[PDB]
Amino acid sequence: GTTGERPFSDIITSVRYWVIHSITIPALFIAGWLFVSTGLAYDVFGTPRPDSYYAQEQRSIPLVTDRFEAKQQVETFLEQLK
Amino acid sequence: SYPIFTVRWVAVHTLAVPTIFFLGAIAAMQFIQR
């Protein structure tokens, strides 16, 4: 009734499994943490930081209004903050 | 006689690996202040 792979219950009760995975699992959790604590995730994805949704005296959404200049429009908006 | 690396192994890690990473990023997110 099995297809040949090692049973899960057998794997995750085994010492070797946990010898490998007590390193890998925290390492990934730390890496994802560092993805955010370093601020890198903001830059990769383009997401506004808490201080860069608006310019200081601005209350207008920087809304993309053009299909083919869209890219330029976003960049123009970002200048209004630097 | 059980293999270690299988289609199953790949499918598992294909979901499990980014899930833990994302869990880490989201946990870091709870300490963000405005």
């Binding site: 490998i20 390193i23 890998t24 990934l28 730390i30 890496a31 560092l34 370093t38 601020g39 | 270690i4």
Partner: peptide, 28 residues
């Protein structure tokens, strides 16, 4: 930039540690 290798070192070390711990039984 520098944040990319900081984000990347635990991943590669984890893969390193796992590669050298399973390597005998993967060769079989």
């Amino acid at each position: 930039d520098w944040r990319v290798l900081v984000v990347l070192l635990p991943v590669l070390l984890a893969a390193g540690w796992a590669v050298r711990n399973i390597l005998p039984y993967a060769v079989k």
